[PDB]
């Protein structure tokens, strides 16, 4: 499922991602846009045998288990298939565990190079909430 921009903003605000660990809601909308283009079924290979899954591109070496990545830690304790659901509940709960791991939203490469230090609130301007 490919979320709409405002549709995703309301869904993530319902999950309490606004100002979670100091990151306003616009950060998470922008992060999903440049990580997965709002696609819940996005899958991308890495160069180390791992894979990023879901609308937030959760990595299969550190966070979820996909059964094919060597030395996977699965610190979110969840199968990567659960992060490919049209329901973003699993991807949000794992994202909260990641951002609270002490490095903030720097774990998402697309957020670092496209959203950090920008007008992230533009991604929620004109939505319901």
């Amino acid at each position: 499922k490919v979320f709409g921009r405002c549709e995703l903003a309301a869904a993530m605000k319902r999950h309490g991602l606004d100002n979670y660990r100091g990151y306003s809601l616009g950060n998470w909308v922008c992060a999903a846009k440049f990580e997965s283009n709002f696609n819940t079924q996005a899958t991308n290979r890495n160069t180390d045998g791992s894979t990023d899954y879901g609308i937030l591109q959760i990595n299969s070496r550190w966070w979820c288990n996909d059964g094919r990545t060597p030395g996977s830690r699965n610190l979110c304790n969840i199968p990567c298939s659960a992060l490919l659901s049209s329901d973003i509940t699993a991807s949000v709960n794992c994202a909260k565990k990641i951002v609270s791991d002490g490095n903030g939203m720097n774990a998402w490469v697309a957020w670092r190079n496209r959203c950090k230090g920008t007008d992230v609130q533009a991604w929620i301007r004109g939505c319901r909430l």
């Binding site: 490095n103 903030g104 939203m105 670092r112």
Partner: protein, 97 residues
């Protein structure tokens, strides 16, 4: 001094603190180390979001020359200017006893 994109900044006879140069599109970094000309190597990875560009390699043998390699893990189709693996050599010091 000339910039060094990979270097040891602190060392003990059995441990090394390496520092390297980061790049914007790196998800994390892989660290490969083993005895120079040895028959086996060890690979480890840093965690996403860790922008300290530092890591400790421990459990090494004193007086042995090691080859340390650091490379940026990227997403396929999102590599861009990422240079690739860089390597250095470092022979650990003898132990006090």
């Amino acid at each position: 001094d000339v910039p060094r994109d990979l270097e040891v900044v602190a060392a003990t006879p059995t441990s090394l603190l390496i520092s390297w140069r980061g790049y914007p599109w790196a998800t994390y970094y892989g660290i490969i180390y083993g005895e120079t000309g040895g028959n086996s190597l060890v690979q480890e990875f840093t965690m996403p979001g860790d922008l300290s560009h530092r890591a400790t390699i421990s459990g090494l043998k004193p007086g042995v020359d090691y080859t340390i390699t650091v490379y940026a893990v990227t997403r396929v189709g999102r590599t861009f200017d990422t240079p690739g693996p860089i390597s250095i050599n470092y022979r650990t010091g003898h132990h006090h006893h």
